[PDB]
Design an enzyme around this catalytic site. Structure first.
Site, short mmCIF file in Angstrom:
data_model
loop_
_atom_site.label_atom_id
_atom_site.label_comp_id
_atom_site.label_asym_id
_atom_site.label_seq_id
_atom_site.Cartn_x
_atom_site.Cartn_y
_atom_site.Cartn_z
N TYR A 26 -96.76 -13.11 -59.94
CA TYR A 26 -96.32 -13.54 -58.43
C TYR A 26 -96.83 -11.60 -58.32
O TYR A 26 -96.88 -10.85 -58.27
CB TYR A 26 -95.19 -13.36 -58.34
CG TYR A 26 -94.32 -12.73 -58.56
CD1 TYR A 26 -93.46 -12.02 -59.06
CD2 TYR A 26 -93.77 -11.92 -56.73
CE1 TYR A 26 -92.18 -12.08 -59.24
CE2 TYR A 26 -92.42 -11.05 -57.34
CZ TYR A 26 -92.09 -10.69 -58.42
OH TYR A 26 -91.07 -9.80 -58.55
N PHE A 36 -95.08 -5.28 -51.77
CA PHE A 36 -93.26 -4.45 -52.06
C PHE A 36 -92.91 -5.44 -53.33
O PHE A 36 -91.85 -4.48 -53.31
CB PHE A 36 -92.57 -5.85 -50.46
CG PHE A 36 -91.72 -6.72 -51.36
CD1 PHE A 36 -94.06 -7.39 -50.06
CD2 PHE A 36 -91.39 -8.25 -51.54
CE1 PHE A 36 -93.66 -8.85 -49.90
CE2 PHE A 36 -92.04 -8.66 -51.05
CZ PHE A 36 -93.07 -10.05 -50.57
N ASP A 37 -93.37 -6.14 -53.89
CA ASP A 37 -92.41 -6.84 -55.25
C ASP A 37 -94.26 -7.16 -55.89
O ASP A 37 -94.60 -7.67 -54.97
CB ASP A 37 -91.81 -7.59 -54.62
CG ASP A 37 -90.72 -7.96 -56.61
OD1 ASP A 37 -91.11 -7.27 -57.23
OD2 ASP A 37 -89.07 -8.77 -56.10
N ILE A 56 -86.04 -17.63 -53.21
CA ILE A 56 -86.60 -18.23 -51.18
C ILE A 56 -87.10 -19.05 -51.78
O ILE A 56 -88.22 -19.99 -52.17
CB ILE A 56 -87.21 -17.44 -50.48
CG1 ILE A 56 -88.97 -17.16 -51.21
CG2 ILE A 56 -85.96 -15.60 -50.69
CD1 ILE A 56 -89.44 -15.63 -50.27
N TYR A 82 -85.66 -14.19 -44.71
CA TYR A 82 -85.10 -12.57 -44.18
C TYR A 82 -85.70 -13.11 -42.58
O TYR A 82 -85.54 -12.06 -41.98
CB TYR A 82 -85.87 -11.43 -44.59
CG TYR A 82 -84.78 -11.41 -46.56
CD1 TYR A 82 -83.92 -11.46 -46.50
CD2 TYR A 82 -86.13 -11.70 -47.31
CE1 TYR A 82 -83.71 -11.25 -47.83
CE2 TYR A 82 -85.40 -11.98 -48.79
CZ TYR A 82 -84.72 -11.29 -48.79
OH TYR A 82 -83.89 -11.24 -49.68
N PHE A 99 -98.07 -14.10 -50.52
CA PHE A 99 -97.68 -13.56 -52.48
C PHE A 99 -99.39 -14.09 -53.27
O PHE A 99 -99.51 -15.70 -52.49
CB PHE A 99 -96.91 -14.52 -52.79
CG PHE A 99 -95.40 -14.08 -52.05
CD1 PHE A 99 -94.29 -12.46 -53.25
CD2 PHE A 99 -94.30 -14.53 -51.51
CE1 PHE A 99 -93.39 -13.11 -52.90
CE2 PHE A 99 -93.48 -14.10 -50.78
CZ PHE A 99 -93.09 -12.99 -51.64
#
Length: 107
Positions: A26, A36-37, A56, A82, A99
């Site tokens: 991912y 962010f990730d 999630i 979120y 993503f």
């Protein structure tokens, strides 16, 4: 609300089932925002299993809708991860998450 835009190569048949520890490359992205990730950064491509609500809902439903080798592109709704809460420092409330999901899994 999981919108899938698959980059073509894969096999189209090896779907994730329940309890299968599966491997996803991912790469997170915010709508009109930066990363962010990413599993590319850690180079530990996040060996997670299906069916325990670990990930999630915008990422869990995108996993079973892919197959081995496939490279989709998530558009996660806010209200599944979120949207009202928001993570402190990473994901704000009411964020539509992006993503770069490739399913090169195991089991």
């Amino acid at each position: 609300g999981v919108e899938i835009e698959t980059i073509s190569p894969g096999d189209g048949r090896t779907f994730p089932k329940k309890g299968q520890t599966c491997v996803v490359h991912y790469t997170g992205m915010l709508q009109n925002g930066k990363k962010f990730d990413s599993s590319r950064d850690r180079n530990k491509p996040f060996k997670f299993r299906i069916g325990k609500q670990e990930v999630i809902k915008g990422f869990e439903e995108g996993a079973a809708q892919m197959s081995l080798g496939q490279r989709a592109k998530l558009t996660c709704t806010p209200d599944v991860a979120y949207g009202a809460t928001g993570h402190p420092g990473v994901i704000p409330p009411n964020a539509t998450l992006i993503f770069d999901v490739e399913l090169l899994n195991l089991e």
